[PDB]
């Protein structure tokens, strides 16, 4: 099992894509730290399901937009298990509104969490991973970042910023063999980034359906665990049903 | 002259690229509002040069990371000429450091200006251009936002974000015929820049060259059908 004796930290893992990722990394042998901010009951469920299928997991509370909370988050993982092999930055929110009506706090809270959180957690991971001379970071971005989407100037700015950040961090950490990649989901059935745009655009998803959380989790597991993915870095993989090919 | 009787606001226009863009948009006929953050003299030097070319310009002090100052910036332009045809989001800064040692304040100051300022100014511009049913927004991004660059996790995440914002804003404003586009310079000779073997054309770009692409998007009738795009002006540095 490719992640036996490895540690994964997944941010915003109480539900949807993040929950699915936590499960798939555990399935593949990792001990998973399941981070949440408010969904504690759901987060406990994720730990219980990992325990149930034979793995090890624990839930850690932390608001990933907050610099000292991120410090305590990583400190808790190293204290429990001594190392960090895989970080998946998945935590994010939407606060949809046309730009004209977009209030500054709807811009800021999306930027601070979706982009700032990736910065804070990538910084903390880099320290530990540079010391190990190994690691893989996977950031969940989103096709909205590549193509834009009415109502979502904050979300798309953030997810595009996550893609740029991904590439810079790939270049800084490459000399130690640390890989840094992004997975860009399209519209996923149960973790829908824009429920309103899915409807309008279902007609032009070439595969004719929404994606599943478990599918996004597989591309993530591949990037995190497959030896072939040791040579992939600074990339964005769309899993979007052919939504964005350009 | 394609910009006669049109009004342009250029943020960060006291020096370098922003200066060359303000000069160029003025030579194409526009009244230009010259935003600066603290260079009152350099700003007025640009205003002066526009006036000796026989143009109209005025300077406005505003830190475009600040909600309340951008609002003041845009009110002062509307109050003076009663319209806004072209916004060029140019102001930006760097705070280079490897990720390992990047301080939270150095992340946040680049993000607040280079990305937050683009949100604030494009929001003020959307309000006006929606009412006009015309306008052009041009954002100065950077090829470093497309390919990443060690030392610049903050600047590249901010410039990549400008590119994503550009696309969403383009889609929101398209139905009234407003174009929204980005121009991504590579390495240009400026204060921000004061080996080379990776630029196929074998030289840095000149600030005037960036200014020509901006003017083209801002003024040329063919650019009415260009929106949601990023044009690299980078000597071949990044071919994508
Ligand atoms: N190779 C390059 O130079 C390169 C490559 C790609 C993209 N770009 C982008 O091009 C744009 C212009 O860069 P440049 O090289 O011309 O810059 P550079 O000469 O430093 O000039 C910066 C300008 O923006 C202003 N500014 C700084 N902080 C501001 C704030 N908070 N609010 C409003 N204005 C502020 C400065 O005004 P003051 O004089 O009052 O401080 C000055 O006018 C930036 O977005 C930059 O990131 C440059």
Q: At B7, which CATH number?
A: 3.40.50.720
Spatial CB neighbours of A177, under 8 Å, sequence gap ≥ 6: A133, A134, A230
Contact A25, A4 (CB under 8 A): no
Using CA atoms, how far residue B237 sits from A172, B59, B114, in Å, is 19, 34, 22
Q: What is the CA radius of gyration of chain A?
A: 17
Contact check, Cβ <8 Å, B168/A158: no
| Catalytic residue status for A155 | yes
d(CA A89, CA A139): 5
**Whole domain around residue A240: which residue ranges?**
1-246
Instruction: Measure B130 CA to nearest chain A CA, in Å.
Output: 9
Mutate to test the pocket of ligand 1, among B11, B37, B151, B159 (most ligand atoms within 8 A of CB): B37
Burial of B106 (0-12, 13-18, 19+ CB in 10 A): middle
Question: Which chain A residues are within 8 Å of B111, Cβ to Cβ?
Answer: 111, 115-116, 161
B-proximal residues of A, 74-103, CB under 8 Å = 98-100, 102
Q: Which of B104, B164, B169, B182 to mutate to test the interface with A (most CBs of A within 10 A)?
A: B164
DSSP per-residue string spanning A117-169: HHHHHHHHHHHHHHHHT--EEEEE--HHHHH--TT-HHHHHHHHHHHHHHHHH
Question: Which chain B residues are within 8 Å of A158, Cβ to Cβ?
Answer: 161, 164
Question: Nearest 5°: phi and psi at A172?
Answer: -75, -30
A243: left (phi over 0), alpha (psi -120 to 50) or beta: alpha
Instruction: Measure A164 CA to nearest chain B CA, in Å.
Output: 5
Both tokens of residue A110? 């999306």
d(CA A52, CA A31): 13
d(CA A87, CA A97): 31
B114 and chain A in contact, CB less than 8 A? no
Secondary structure, 3-state, B8-26:
EEECCCCCHHHHHHHHHHH
d(CA A225, CA A210): 25
A-proximal residues of B, 29-68, CB under 8 Å = 67
Alpha helix positions (H), B56-206? 67-81, 104-110, 117-132, 144-147, 153-173
d(CA A214, CA B39): 54
SS3 call for B56 = coil
Using CA atoms, how far residue B137 sits from B126, B171, B173, B184, B224, in Å, is 9, 12, 10, 14, 12
Question: DSSP letter at B221?
Answer: G
How many C-beta atoms lie closer than 10 Å to residue A245's C-beta? 7
Both tokens of residue B67? 């909600």
Range A213-234 burial, b when 16+ CB lie within 10 A, else e: bebbbbbbbbbbbeeebeeebb
State yes or no: cis peptide before B17, omega within 30 of 0. no
The residue whose two tokens read 């004061």 is B194
d(CA B186, CA A191): 37
Question: Nearest 5°: phi and psi at B160?
Answer: -65, -30
d(CA B203, CA A218): 45
**Sheet arrangement for strand B136-140:** B57-61, B31-36, B7-10, B86-89, B136-140, B179-185, B230-233
The residue whose two tokens read 């096709």 is A143
Question: DSSP letter at A228?
Answer: G
* Residue B124: closest CA among B179, B69, B53: B69
Cα atoms in the 13 Å half-sphere on the side-chain side of B125:
32
Instruction: Write out the binding residues of A.
Output: 12-15, 17, 37-39, 63-64, 90, 155-159, 186, 188, 190, 192-193
d(CA A216, CA A24): 10
A33 bridge partner residues: A9, A58
Domain count, chain A: 1
Instruction: Measure B126 CA to nearest chain A CA, in Å.
Output: 6
Q: How determined?
A: X-ray
H or E element at residue A32? strand A31-36
Q: What is the CA radius of gyration of chain B?
A: 17
């Amino acid at each position: 099992l490719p992640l036996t004796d490895r540690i994964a930290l997944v941010t915003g893992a109480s539900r949807g894509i993040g929950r699915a990722i936590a499960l798939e990394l555990a399935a593949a042998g990792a001990k998973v730290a399941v981070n949440y901010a408010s969904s504690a009951g759901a987060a406990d469920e994720v730990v219980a399901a990992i325990a149930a299928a034979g793995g090890e997991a624990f839930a850690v509370k932390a608001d990933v937009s907050q610099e000292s909370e991120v410090e305590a988050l990583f400190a808790a993982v190293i204290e429990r298990w001594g190392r960090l092999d895989v970080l998946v930055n998945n935590a994010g929110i939407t606060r949809d509104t046309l730009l004209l009506r977009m209030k500054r706090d709807d811009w800021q809270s999306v930027l601070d969490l979706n982009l700032g959180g990736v910065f804070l957690c990538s910084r903390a991971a880099a320290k530990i991973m540079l010391k190990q001379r190994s690691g893989r970071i996977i950031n969940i971005a989103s096709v909205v970042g590549e193509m834009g989407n009415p109502g979502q100037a904050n979300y798309s700015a953030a997810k595009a910023g996550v893609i740029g950040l991904t590439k810079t961090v790939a270049k800084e950490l490459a000399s130690r063999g640390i890989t840094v990649n992004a997975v860009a989901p399209g519209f996923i059935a149960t973790d829908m980034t824009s429920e309103l745009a899915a409807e309008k655009l279902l007609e032009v998803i070439p595969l004719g359906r929404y994606g599943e959380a478990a599918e996004v989790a597989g591309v993530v597991r591949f990037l995190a665990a497959d030896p072939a993915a040791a040579y992939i870095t600074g990339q964005v993989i769309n899993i979007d049903g052919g939504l964005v090919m350009a």
